[PDB]
Chain length 314, copies 4
């Protein structure tokens, strides 16, 4: 089950969807007219819409009075203490990949299916074009759409628990330090190696084309159960990225004979510091992120590779 109503690779609703969360790219200019159009349309079939509190306080949305008549029907949440985990049937994302990551931040448990929309530039996780969006949204609502069960990593930080869920990767690297970083990595309680360099890009398949790909990791389809381990410019000619089964335990610590501390980041945010007495535990989460695909998983993955990463051009 994914959300209060949606469940499952096709998508089934059982109960008709009535609550939708639209997530905007925060400070942007080209995403005002499409956001207004989408919100106006989504409430023409009497369907509850949710909007971040920080979006309605924007000066460029309160100034317009034509949209203000229909804006009052927003089930606003302030994100300070509101748990919208059990209140959303499916999500529409506007702006790019960074929006989808934020969509995974708000749902640390089961997450409803998402429908990412790309409006400008190119997105690897955003397959839907905003043109003719009415028909696509209607088809998604009816229940004729395929999804991919994108894996996520459950990460726990023990300081001498924080319980984060990450989508692309968790990065353990160096911050202001300009020297080598020595980090010990354990798999199932056994020391497998010590990385001596900028850091590691332990990731998910859907993060294989992310920052992991920049460091030399291979392209991994999101339909395989696997966990990547990829360095960041290691000071060793023979440390290639490795792929491990999804059902294993990963642990990451600072080696006892190490100078400087380490810095851990989750999808580019929540950048905190780990010292000698801290530990990071990584597993494969039981709550995947279903993202609706326009036609099918493999074709969308390969077209994203072709357009975004220019994989095998000429």
């Amino acid at each position: 089950t994914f959300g209060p109503k949606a469940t499952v690779v096709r998508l089934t609703w059982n109960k008709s969807p009535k609550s939708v969360l639209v997530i905007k790219k925060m400070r942007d200019a080209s995403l005002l007219q499409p956001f207004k159009e989408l919100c106006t349309h989504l409430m023409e079939e009497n369907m509850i819409v949710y909007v971040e509190k920080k979006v309605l306080e924007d000066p460029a949305i309160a100034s317009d009075e034509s949209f203000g008549a229909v804006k009052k029907k927003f089930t606003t949440f302030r994100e300070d203490y509101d748990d919208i985990s059990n209140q959303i049937d499916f999500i529409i994302c506007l702006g790019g990949d960074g929006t989808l990551l934020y969509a995974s931040s708000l749902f640390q448990g089961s997450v409803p299916p998402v429908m990412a929309f790309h409006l400008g530039s190119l997105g690897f996780l955003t397959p839907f074009s905003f043109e003719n969006f009415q028909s696509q949204v209607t088809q998604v609502i009816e229940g004729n759409a395929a999804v991919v069960l994108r894996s996520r990593l459950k990460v726990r930080v023990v300081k001498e628990a924080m319980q984060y869920q990450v989508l692309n990767e968790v990065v353990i690297d160096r911050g202001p330090s300009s020297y080598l970083s020595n980090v010990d990595v354990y798999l199932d309680g056994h020391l497998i190696t010590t990385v001596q360099g900028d850091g590691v890009i332990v990731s998910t398949p859907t993060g294989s084309t992310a920052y992991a790909a920049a460091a030399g990791a291979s392209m991994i389809h999101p339909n395989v159960p696997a966990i990547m381990i990829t360095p960041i410019c290691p000071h060793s000619l023979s440390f290639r990225p490795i792929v491990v089964p999804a059902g294993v335990e990963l642990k990451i610590m600072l080696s006892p004979e190490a100078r400087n501390t380490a810095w851990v980041s989750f999808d580019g945010r929540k950048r905190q510091e780990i010292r000698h007495g801290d530990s990071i535990s990584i597993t494969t989460s039981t709550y995947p992120l279903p993202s609706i695909c326009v036609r099918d998983p493999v074709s969308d993955w390969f077209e994203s590779l072709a357009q975004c990463l220019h994989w095998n051009v000429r």
Copy 2:
């Protein structure tokens, strides 16, 4: 798995073991005789390829000939080994185990690989104190790794091969670039221009695929690999695809020269414009017995053979 054969359960006590020896070798004779004499003091039937018994260096010794007469002989010509062997012991190195996969095109009994000197990624058992190890495996206290294999069909205008490490399409005598098209689920995913591609198993991730820049994949990860051989494109990163897909490699219509297909570094065939290669994930894996557990053996192989992250 076999007639009677993640832990290993025997159900029926093993009695028919096949010992595969590395041909054209001299350091393996004494361990081969020792292992064969030991395996036939528990009244357990052993199998040896016919070409091994006709070796001049093994017929010249009459001490081994007394126990040699109890061998069960197959010649690979018409005496194809079948669901009659429930335990395999391999001597010599990695290429021996590959041969073990060549002999069994269907379900394969569990295999024991011995590294008699040198180093082998797929050979984790040291020959020292082999009596206790073989006894423990015969009893039924041993973990196994189900290595996946690729089912390959060659259609010429069927061959039905099973491969362990990879299938390599490349160029032979040709010195020009090679253009071959690849289909995934009946869809043009790419055309590769260069030497070729090394579509492989996780077991082949550390093989010739690793030579071309492919990543390291544990044999417990259910996926198929696609890595090039020096492509004339900076962007063609090796890719990993689900095990349930079907790959179809052909020659592009606007392609000069023919292509050459090799299965686990073995018999090479030539494919022309009208030929196709279909690759899927086989339903008959290769159970390889591990000394202690899969992960530690894999990482020891990485550290000892490939020198993965030394110093």
Copy 3:
């Protein structure tokens, strides 16, 4: 000096050029009309034009009688029989990169400047577009053009055969399906033994060639260097290396090696090297002058952007 008259980076003619060599891409169809146009234009300034004998015996070169009056004024030469050597002031190439390689094959010593043309192919070493070729060829004839002196490798095979290679010389394994073990000496010292498909020891101008496919870095043709890059080694550490151009390389088969090896010179005639054979590689004293449209750096980076799509988006 580069040829009988051309000399030197700007090109100085000293004596007015009168002998020109046009090299065609052999079996092709889209190149006949540009070849005919260039040949007709070249002899309206009273330029002696040299053409390969096999080109003039093509079926679609005498079937047209309009061009018949032109073929009578070609100084025909034949491969392996007549050595053109020091008789050509500068060369014009048509068809693509390989033609330039063939241009290096005909001149084992000093070679005249080459004005490469790309026709229906993009090409890394072919920077001239055939459009408005009259002004370009006139400007080159006058003597206002920049030149990139591409280094070449001098290779001797001892079994006393000598070759000059432009892109690289490749020592690899052919019909063998097993690993190839070959030993490399630098200045008489064992620096490495490689266990894999082979090595792509190359010139800078061959860096973007088959060397690049194997993971080599992009090497500008104005740096004096010799590359050594492998072909899929069975080792994660054997990163490609760059050595000074003034060194001696000597490649052999290791004593404990199975099978023989195969040596190829610029993707051409392949020889077999056994245990008793040796390959000696140095930097030649006869570079290949290649005329450039604007200047070496911008042309190199444009070739990287168009051909190899270096850093797109």
Copy 4:
């Protein structure tokens, strides 16, 4: 000329060396005994020695009164005075030496104590004979190229670096967007962590960690290597030593960038700042044990394990 007296690839002194500078790897307890032994030996041929002031300030250097008498003959300092340099500690010491000599650099005899090291080929065992042979003038050197870097702020600041210059991101977690120009021509913009524009000596450094090839220090070139670029086709490149590189921030760039010289003091560059990199005319001569190429391959074999088994 390299220093007041040393000149040149063989090394010729012309005038007998008399002033030598010893550089110690800061606080390293393993180097105290070699430092004392070397300083005692160097002042038995009546040869002037130079030491950093902070080395004598070490609490565990005046406690031993045996070395105090030897200590009192140090020409301590807190150019044009040092004939050649002896380095103890490892690779990072040599870089520090290049920091002290922004102009002509005297030859350096690097020693590896407690570390293996790439640029430190001399073993401390039997150091008497090695130092004597160096003093006599029977030794070969390699002329390691350096990069001259000028930072222009919209305040000129010159620098000479030995390994590389790194233009990366600091605390920022987003991609860094920086434009690079060669001879006034925009060659590319890089979309990632940064660039590792380097020397051949730095080819085995942090540049090698990002996928750059090894270049022998006798090959004149300037390397450009990314740091995990967000592109599959940005292969590292080399350029002739005679070119001029100019790195800036693109006009449509978020966040700033940080420039680091050999792993030292980090500066911040805004949109109005520029970095100009050329090949310096003052190389760093480092004396070799036997010959350049064999020492380079020895360092590749035991430091980076290049092509093992």
